[PDB]
Ligand binder design. Structure first.
Ligand SMILES: [Mg+2]
Ligand SMILES: [Zn+2]
Ligand SMILES: [Zn+2]
Lengths: 107, 1270
DNA sequence: AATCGGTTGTGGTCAGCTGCTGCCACCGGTTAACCTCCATTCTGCTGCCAGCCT
DNA sequence: AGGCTGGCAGCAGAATTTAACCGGTGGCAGCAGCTGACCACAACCGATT
C-alpha cells in the first residue's frame, strides 16, 4: 500500500475569534497607481517596499524613506567593447567610417 | 455572489474571464519555474508552490517560524510575507502568470466551428497562419491619405518603371554594339557558316534572357502596385518579401502584424452592432450559400452582442495558475516523489515567458523573437488542451501529458468519475449464498462484516453498558474482538435496515433494503425470491452492502425500498417475487392429478359403498401418512375452512355468506387442499394444476385485492411448500431418462435421399450454387421439425425432462430437442446457415467435425452477449438524460385531450375478438370521455382507471374504442400530472405527486437489453431500437405516399420508379431512385400499377422514416408510429413494457418547433426552440401588432434533445464537455439548478420524491388529547 | 506546636544570541586552429468543379 | 463574353558530443562567552491560631 505525505502539518486547535494579537495596517502603492493593504503585527517594523499582488514592488505610502539607489548593470555592450578597445582606436575607426560615408555620398 | 459556499445557491453562471478577472482572483504572480528545494524539500519563493502566494504549508505558522500560534491569526510576517492561517487555503488560492506577449485561447480558435473565425470572418486556415506567425494581416489602412496621394504615387511608379525600361534600352544598345562587332569579326574571317550563327544565337539568347529579367522585374513592380491599390483590413500577406517591399515603399497608410496581438487589434477595431445589422440584412434579403453562412455567423455575433460579453476575452494577457494541492507533489514511502503533470505544463509556460522577456530586453532580431512568441503560444495551448493542435507533448516513455481539459472530459473525467458517482464509507461486499430459511424482509449478514460496518454504534454501546471506560478502550475492544462485542452487536443491529446492491443496477429493484440478522461464516444469505429482481444466481456472484445513517435515510429504507413492499415489477406490473424453478416443480407436482393413483375415489356399488370419501383433510392426511392415499389421487373431501368457488358458493349458500365453518363437499385431490391452505382465508378454492402462469395469475389477483403484507406472507408460504414437495418429487437426470426417438434413422434417411437428389441436380448443372444451398436449408429445417415432433410424441408426460420444461419452471423444448434428437443446422462466422446439419444429439455425442462446426456459432453468441450488455447500458444512459425532467407535479391538469386506443376489433362473423396487446395499451389508464353504447347510457364514466372489470364491461356492452388520457397530450407546463400518467404499475394505484416517472421509464425500456437479438438489410434487434429513439433515417428506408391518388409502377432498368397522380388534379409526386433489392409492399397482395393509395401509405417494403410521417401526416401519427415500432422489437422476444413508458420518451422528442420565418422577435430561422416559449413570444407579438413567427414541428433524437437543454451543468456532464462549455461561456449562460442531475452534482436534495416542498416541510406534533394524557 | 506566604545561599543549568571563525553551497562569467537546416459509425464542415444564365 | 450555385468528395470530431578555472557572497554550523533567566534543594523568616 502506497502512503504519501504532502509535507505539511495539521494541528488540533479550537479556532477562536476573540483573544487575538493586535495588528496594524500598512498601505503600499505600485508604479501604476494600485494600492494594497497589508496587516502587519503591532510590534513589528514596517518595511519600505513590499512585493504586492501584481508581482511588482510598491513603495510605502508615507513620505519618510530615502532608501532606493542605483544598482546599475556593469555589463552592457559598451562596457564589453571598452574593455578590449581604446578611445583613440575607436575614434580612428569612427573617423575612417565617416570618411568612407563622405566619399560614398559626397565624394 | 457567494464565495465561501454556504448552501443557499440560486444560480451558477458561466462566462468568459478577462484579464482583470484573472488578476483579481490571483493572490500573487508566480515568476519562477521552481517547485521545492532539492535539499530541504521546502517550497521556493516565487515558485509554483510558493507560500507567500498560496498560503502556508503548516497550520498557523509562517515560513521562517517567527509566528506560530492562533494568537497570531491573520497577520502577515514582515520577513517572509506568509500569512499565518490554515494550511487548507492551499486548495483555494490562485495565482497568475503575466505574459510578455498576448496569446489566444485554444478553445475559441481551433475547435469546429471556429468561433474566432466566425466573429472576424477569417477562414481557419487563414487564421492559423496569422496566430502561428506564418503570414501577416492588415490591421488598419488609411483611406483619406491613400485617396489624396494615389496620383503622386502612380507618378512615382511610372517614373521608376521608365528608368527600368531605359536601363533595358541601354542594354539593347550595348548588346547591339557587341553583336555588330561579332558580325564584323565573323563574316570577314573564314569559318563555318553555321558557327558564325551560333555566337549570334547565343547573343540573341542573351537578349531574350535579359529582356526576360526586365519583364519579370516589371511584373514584380506591377504586383506591388496592385497590392497597394487593393489594400484593405483583414487581408493576408504571405510572401514576406512582398510585405517588406510594401512597408519599404508605402510604410505609411497601413499597419500590419502577426500573431495574437494582431488578432486582438482586429477585435479592438470591430463593430459588433454594425456587423450584426449587416448579417441580418443578408439573412433577410439574400439567399443560398450566403444566407446559410450568414446564419451560422450570426449565432456567435448575436451571442456577443445580446450579452454583456466583449470578444476581447478570447485573447489572453494573463494565465491563471491552479492551487498547489490540486496538483500536488507527494513524497512516497522510501523518499520517492510523485508529481502531477500540470507542473510540467506550467513550467514550460514560465520558462518560455521568461526567455521572451530576456530576448525583448536584449533587442534580438525578429526571427528569434517571433520563434519565441510562437513557442510561447504553443506551450499555453498545450497547457489548456494537449494534442488538439499538433502532436501532444509527451513525458517519459512516450506518454502524453494530462492537460487541463483532460481533467474534465470523458468517462474518467471529473463529471463522470467523481461527481455523478463516488466511493462511500459504511460499505461492505461479500459473496451471496442462498438463505431459504429467511423471510422476505430479511438478509443474513456475516458477523465480521457487521462488526466493521456498525463500529461507532457498538463503541457507543460498550461505553454505555460500562464494558469500557472510554472511547479509546472501547475501540480497542472492537479491534481485538472481545467476547462482549457480539452480545452488544446483536443489540445495535436489531431493526436497522441495510441496502443490498448487485451490479449492474439495471432497474430500480437492483437495490433493496433488508433487515439484517447475524450469521456465522463469511457469506451473505439472500432470500430465494429476490434473485429475479437482483438477477443473481449463486455461481460466484457478489453483493454490496450499504448502511443508512440518519433518521430520514432509515425511514426511506424501511418504507420506500423494503423488499416486501416491492413485489410487482414497475415496467409491466407482473409479479417478480414469485415462485420459480424448484418452487414451481414442487407446486406443480403437488397439484397435478394422476388417474388410477392410490386410494382413489371409486363410485362403486353393488357390494360396498364408494370408499374414496373423507370427512376432513386431517383424516386425509392421516390416510396419506399410512400407505393408503396418494397426494395426487382424486378424492372427495369435506371442507369447512376453505371457501367454495363462485358457482358452488352461489348454488349451496344463500344470498351471501359462505361464513367459515359451513361445510361443503369438494371433489379434488389432497394436494390441492394442501395448496389452498396456503392462500388467504377468504380466497376461493382454486382446483387447478399449478403451471407458472396459473401461479402468476393468482399472485396478481392477490396483489390487486389484498394488502401488501398479506401478499408477502403468502409468497413465503408458497416458497416453503414448493421446496418441500420439490425434493419429494422425483426429478433426476440419468442417461435412461434421455430417451431417443425410435424413428430417427428412418426420418434422416428419408431426408438424406432428398438432399442427395438436390446435390446430384447441382452436379448435372441444372441449378446454381446459391439455390442449391436454399434447397438444402429448407430440407433440413423440415427434418429438424419432424425429429422434434417424433421426440415429443415419444416422451411420456411424467419424464423429468418433459416435466421441468412443461411446468414452466425452466427451459424450452428446443433444448430438449438438441439434447435428445438432433442439433440441426448451425451458422457460419458470418451468420448464414451451413448446408450440412448436425445430425447427432448431445446424448449420442457429436463427431469431431460436427463439434468443430458447432463451436463457430457458440463463440459468436458469447461475444455478442458481451457487446449487447455494453450497448444496452449506453442506451439507458441516453434515455435517462433525455427524460429526467418528467416528474409528476400535479394531480389533474384537467385537459380534454387524449389518445384513442384500439380495444378488440370486430370480426365479420360478428363477435368481439379481444386485442392481443390490451394489457400494455388500455389497462392502467384513465378514461378521458364517457363510454356510451349507441349514444345510450354511460358504462364507464370519465376518470376511471380501466381495470379488468371495466374492460369486461366495455366489451360486454360492445364498445370497441375508448379515449384515454396520455402523457403525450398533457397540459401541465413542467412535468406531468398524475391523472394523465395513470396507475403506477408497481403499486397498482394512482401515481404520487413526486414520482420520477422518466427515470422509471428509461430503466423499464433499457433493462430488457441483452435479450434482444437480431434474428435466427433491415435492422431488427437492439440496433433497431437505438435508431428509432435517435430519429435517424433507417437503413432500409421505404418511401411513403404524399397524397391520395393513383400510382404509376414504372419498371425501369432493373429497378423501380413510382409516380403518384393525385385525385385533386395537382402535380404528380415522383419517387425516383428505388433499387430493386427492396420488394413492394403487400396489403390484404402486392402493389400493382394503376392502384389507389392513401396519404400515409408505405409504397415499398422496409422501414418508413419518422421524419416524413411527421411532415406528411402530423404529430399524432408519428406518436402512433414510434410507439408501435419500438414495441414490435420487444414483443418479438416476449417482453412486456406498458406503452406509458415509451410515451414518456416519445413526448420529449416532440417538445420543439423549428423556425421558418423570424417574424419580428429574436428567433433566427432554422433554430429549434421550445413550443411553450414559441407561443409565449407570439401572444406578446400579436399584441402590439400582427407579426408572429412561424414554426413547424421537429422530431429530435435522444442525444440531440438532451444536449439542447437549459442547464449547462447537466449538458456538460452528459457528453461533449468541451463544446458545451465553450459556448455556454460565449452565451454567458446561467443555470437555475432545477434538474435532477444538477442537484446531485452540487450536493442538495433532488426535486423529486421526498425532496419536494410538499413533503419536506411537514410539521409533526402530538395531538391535543395525547399530549395532555401522558 | 503549625501554616501561608517571602528571602535567598548556593549550585547547576540551559538555551539565546553574539561574535566569530572558518567553510561550504550557489551563482555568474570565461574559455579565440577549424567544422553552419528535423477500428467502426455517425455527423457536420469546408473546399472542388461542372453547368446553366446574362 | 464571364459567373455563382448545385451535387460532390474529402476531412475532422465524438461516442462505444566531450568540461573545466575563478571571483565573490550569503548561508551554515559549531563553539566559547557571556549570560540571563530558569530550576531546585535546602535553609531561614513573618505573622498568626
Ligand atoms: Mg452468476
Ligand atoms: Zn515569517
Ligand atoms: Zn395532464
Amino acid at each position: 500500500v502506497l502512503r504519501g505525505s504532502r509535507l505539511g502539518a495539521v494541528s488540533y486547535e479550537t479556532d477562536r475569534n476573540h483573544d487575538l494579537a493586535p495588528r496594524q495596517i500598512a498601505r503600499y502603492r505600485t508604479d501604476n497607481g494600485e494600492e494594497f493593504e497589508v496587516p502587519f503585527a503591532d510590534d513589528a517594523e514596517i518595511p519600505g517596499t513590499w512585493l504586492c499582488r501584481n508581482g511588482m514592488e510598491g513603495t510605502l505610502i508615507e513620505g519618510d524613506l530615502p532608501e532606493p539607489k542605483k544598482v546599475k548593470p556593469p555589463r552592457t555592450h559598451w562596457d564589453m567593447l571598452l574593455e578590449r578597445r581604446s578611445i583613440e582606436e575607436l575614434e580612428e575607426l569612427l573617423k575612417e567610417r565617416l570618411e568612407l560615408i563622405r566619399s560614398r555620398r559626397r565624394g | 455572489g457567494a464565495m465561501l459556499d454556504v448552501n443557499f445557491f440560486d444560480e451558477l453562471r458561466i462566462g468568459l474571464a478577462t484579464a482583470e478577472d484573472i488578476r483579481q482572483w490571483s493572490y500573487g504572480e508566480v515568476k519562477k519555474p521552481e517547485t521545492i528545494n532539492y535539499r530541504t524539500l521546502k517550497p521556493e519563493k516565487d515558485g509554483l508552490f510558493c507560500e507567500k502566494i498560496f498560503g502556508p504549508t503548516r497550520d498557523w505558522e509562517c515560513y521562517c517560524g517567527k509566528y506560530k500560534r492562533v494568537r497570531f491569526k491573520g497577520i502577515i510576517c514582515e520577513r517572509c510575507g506568509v500569512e499565518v492561517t490554515r494550511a487548507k487555503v492551499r486548495r483555494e488560492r490562485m495565482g497568475h502568470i503575466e505574459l510578455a506577449a498576448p496569446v489566444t485561447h485554444i478553445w475559441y480558435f481551433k475547435g469546429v466551428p471556429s468561433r474566432l473565425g466566425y466573429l472576424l470572418d477569417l477562414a481557419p486556415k487563414d487564421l492559423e497562419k496569422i496566430i502561428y506567425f506564418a503570414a501577416y494581416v492588415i490591421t488598419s489602412v488609411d483611406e483619406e491619405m491613400r485617396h489624396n496621394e494615389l496620383s503622386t504615387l502612380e507618378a512615382e511608379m511610372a517614373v521608376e518603371r521608365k528608368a527600368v525600361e531605359d536601363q533595358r534600352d541601354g542594354e539593347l544598345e550595348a548588346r547591339a554594339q557587341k553583336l555588330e562587332a561579332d558580325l564584323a569579326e565573323l563574316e570577314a574571317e573564314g569559318a563555318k557558316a553555321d558557327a558564325r550563327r551560333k555566337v549570334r544565337d547565343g547573343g540573341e539568347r542573351e537578349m531574350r534572357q535579359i529582356r526576360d529579367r526586365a519583364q519579370r522585374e516589371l511584373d514584380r513592380l506591377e504586383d506591388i502596385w496592385s497590392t497597394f491599390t487593393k489594400l484593405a483590413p483583414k487581408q493576408l500577406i504571405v510572401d514576406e518579401n512582398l510585405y517588406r517591399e510594401l512597408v519599404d515603399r508605402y510604410g505609411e497608410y497601413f499597419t500590419g502584424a502577426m500573431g495574437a496581438e494582431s488578432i486582438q487589434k482586429l477585435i479592438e477595431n470591430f463593430d459588433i452592432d454594425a456587423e450584426a445589422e449587416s448579417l441580418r440584412d443578408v439573412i433577410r434579403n439574400g439567399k443560398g450559400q450566403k444566407k446559410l453562412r450568414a446564419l451560422k455567423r450570426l449565432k456567435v455575433v448575436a451571442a456577443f452582442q445580446q450579452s454583456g460579453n466583449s470578444p476581447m476575452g478570447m485573447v489572453l494577457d494573463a494565465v491563471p495558475v491552479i492551487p498547489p494541492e490540486l496538483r500536488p507533489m507527494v513524497q512516497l514511502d522510501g523518499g520517492r516523489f510523485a508529481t502531477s503533470d500540470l507542473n510540467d505544463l506550467y513550467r514550460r509556460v514560465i520558462n518560455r515567458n521568461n526567455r521572451l522577456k530576456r530576448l525583448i530586453d536584449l533587442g534580438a532580431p525578429e526571427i528569434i523573437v517571433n520563434n519565441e512568441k510562437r513557442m510561447l503560444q504553443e506551450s499555453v495551448d498545450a497547457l489548456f488542451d494537449n494534442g488538439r493542435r499538433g502532436r501532444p507533448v509527451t513525458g517519459p516513455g512516450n506518454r502524453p501529458l494530462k492537460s487541463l481539459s483532460d481533467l474534465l472530459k470523458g468517462k474518467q473525467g471529473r463529471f463522470r468519475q467523481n461527481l455523478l458517482g463516488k466511493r462511500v464509507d459504511y460499505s461492505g461486499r461479500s459473496v451471496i449464498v442462498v438463505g431459504p430459511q429467511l423471510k422476505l424482509h430479511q438478509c443474513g449478514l456475516p458477523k465480521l462484516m457487521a462488526l466493521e460496518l456498525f463500529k461507532p454504534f457498538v463503541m457507543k454501546r460498550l461505553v454505555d453498558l460500562n464494558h469500557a471506560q472510554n472511547i479509546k478502550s472501547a475501540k480497542r475492544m472492537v479491534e481485538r474482538q472481545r467476547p462482549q462485542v457480539w452480545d452488544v452487536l446483536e443489540e445495535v443491529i436489531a431493526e436497522h435496515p441495510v441496502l443490498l446492491n448487485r451490479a449492474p443496477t439495471l432497474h430500480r429493484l437492483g437495490i433493496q433494503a433488508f433487515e439484517p440478522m447475524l450469521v456465522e461464516g463469511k457469506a451473505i444469505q439472500l432470500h430465494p425470491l429476490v434473485c429475479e429482481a437482483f438477477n443473481a444466481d449463486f455461481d460466484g456472484d457478489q453483493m454490496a452492502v450499504h448502511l443508512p445513517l440518519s433518521a430520514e435515510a432509515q425511514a426511506e429504507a424501511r418504507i420506500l425500498m423494503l423488499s416486501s413492499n416491492n413485489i410487482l415489477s414497475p415496467a409491466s406490473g407482473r409479479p417478480l417475487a414469485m415462485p420459480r424453478l424448484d418452487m414451481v416443480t414442487g407446486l406443480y407436482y403437488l397439484t397435478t392429478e394422476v388417474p388410477g393413483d392410490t386410494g382413489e375415489y371409486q363410485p362403486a356399488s353393488g357390494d360396498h359403498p364408494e370408499t374414496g370419501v373423507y370427512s376432513s383433510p386431517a383424516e386425509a392426511i392421516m390416510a396419506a401418512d399410512r400407505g393408503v392415499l396418494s397426494v395426487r389421487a382424486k378424492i372427495k373431501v369435506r371442507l369447512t375452512q376453505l371457501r367454495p368457488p363462485v358457482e358452488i358458493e352461489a348454488e349451496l349458500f344463500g344470498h351471501s355468506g359462505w361464513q367459515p365453518g359451513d361445510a361443503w363437499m369438494a371433489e379434488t385431490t389432497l394436494g390441492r387442499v394442501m395448496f389452498n391452505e396456503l392462500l388467504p382465508l377468504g380466497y376461493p378454492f382454486v382446483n387447478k394444476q399449478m403451471h407458472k402462469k396459473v401461479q402468476a395469475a393468482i399472485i396478481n389477483d392477490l396483489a390487486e385485492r389484498y394488502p401488501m403484507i398479506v401478499v408477502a406472507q403468502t409468497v413465503d408460504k408458497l416458497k416453503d411448500a414448493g421446496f418441500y414437495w420439490a425434493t419429494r418429487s422425483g426429478v433426476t437426470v440419468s442417461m435412461a431418462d434421455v430417451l431417443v426417438p425410435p424413428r430417427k434413422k428412418e426420418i434422416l434417411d428419408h431426408y438424406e435421399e432428398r438432399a442427395d437428389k438436390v446435390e446430384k441436380q447441382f452436379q448435372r448443372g441444372a441449378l446454381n450454387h446459391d439455390e442449391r444451398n436454399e434447397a438444402l436449408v429448407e430440407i433440413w429445417k423440415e427434418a429438424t421439425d419432424e425429429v422434434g415432433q417424433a421426440l415429443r410424441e415419444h416422451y411420456p408426460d411424467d419424464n423429468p425432462i418433459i416435466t421441468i420444461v412443461d411446468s414452466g419452471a425452466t427451459g424450452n423444448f428446443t433444448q430438449t430437442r438438441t439434447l435428445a434428437g438432433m442439433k440441426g443446422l448451425v451458422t457460419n462466422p458470418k451468420g448464414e446457415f451451413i448446408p450440412r446439419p448436425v445430425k447427432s444429439s448431445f446424448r449420442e455425442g457429436l463427431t469431431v467435425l460436427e463439434y468443430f462446426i458447432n463451436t463457430h456459432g457458440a463463440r459468436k453468441g458469447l461475444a455478442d452477449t458481451a457487446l449487447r450488455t455494453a450497448d444496452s447500458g449506453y442506451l439507458t444512459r441516453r434515455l435517462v438524460d433525455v427524460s429526467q425532467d418528467v416528474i409528476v407535479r400535479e394531480h389533474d391538469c384537467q385537459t380534454e385531450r387524449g389518445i384513442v386506443v384500439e380495444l378488440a376489433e370486430r370480426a365479420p362473423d360478428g363477435t368481439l375478438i379481444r386485442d392481443p396487446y390490451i394489457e400494455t395499451s388500455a389497462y392502467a389508464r384513465t378514461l378521458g370521455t364517457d363510454a356510451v353504447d349507441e349514444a345510450g347510457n354511460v358504462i364507464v364514466e370519465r376518470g376511471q382507471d380501466l381495470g379488468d372489470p371495466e374492460i369486461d364491461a366495455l366489451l360486454a356492452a360492445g364498445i370497441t374504442q375508448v379515449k384515454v388520457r396520455s402523457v403525450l397530450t398533457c397540459a401541465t407546463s413542467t412535468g406531468v400530472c398524475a391523472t394523465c400518467y395513470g396507475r403506477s404499475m408497481a403499486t397498482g394505484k394512482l401515481v404520487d405527486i413526486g414520482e420520477a416517472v422518466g427515470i422509471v421509464a428509461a430503466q423499464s425500456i433499457g433493462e430488457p437489453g441483452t435479450q434482444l437479438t437480431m434474428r435466427t438489410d433491415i435492422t431488427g434487434g437492439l440496433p433497431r431500437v437505438q435508431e428509432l429513439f435517435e430519429a435517424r433515417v433507417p437503413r432500409g428506408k421505404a418511401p411513403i405516399a404524399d397524397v391520395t391518388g393513383r400510382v404509376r409502377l414504372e419498371d425501369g432498368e432493373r429497378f423501380y420508379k413510382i409516380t403518384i397522380v393525385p385525385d385533386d388534379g395537382g402535380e404528380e409526386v415522383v419517387y425516383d431512385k428505388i433499387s430493386k433489392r427492396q420488394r413492394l409492399r403487400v396489403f390484404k397482395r402486392v402493389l400493382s400499377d394503376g392502384d389507389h393509395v392513401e396519404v400515409g401509405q408505405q409504397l415499398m417494403e422496409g422501414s418508413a422514416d419518422p421524419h416524413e410521417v411527421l411532415r406528411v401526416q402530423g404529430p399524432r401519427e408519428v406518436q402512433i408510429h414510434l410507439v408501435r415500432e419500438v414495441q414490435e422489437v420487444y414483443r418479438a422476444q416476449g417482453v412486456s413494457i406498458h406503452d406509458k413508458h415509451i410515451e414518456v420518451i416519445v413526448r420529449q422528442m416532440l417538445r420543439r418547433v423549428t423556425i421558418i420565418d423570424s417574424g419580428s422577435t429574436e428567433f433566427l430561422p432554422g433554430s429549434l426552440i421550445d413550443r411553450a416559449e414559441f407561443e409565449a413570444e407570439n401572444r406578446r407579438v400579436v399584441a402590439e401588432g400582427g407579426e408572429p413567427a412561424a414554426g413547424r414541428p421537429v422530431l429530435m433524437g435522444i442525444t440531440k434533445a438532451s444536449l439542447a437543454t437549459d442547464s449547462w451543468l447537466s449538458a456538460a456532464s452528459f457528453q461533449e464537455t468541451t463544446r458545451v462549455l465553450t459556448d455556454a461561456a460565449i452565451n454567458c449562460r446561467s443555470d437555475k439548478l432545477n434538474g435532477l442531475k444538477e442537484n446531485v452534482i452540487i450536493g442538495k436534495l433532488i426535486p423529486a420524491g421526498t425532496g419536494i416542498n410538499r413533503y419536506r416541510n411537514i410539521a409533526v406534533q402530538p395531538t391535543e388529547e395525547a399530549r395532555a394524557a401522558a
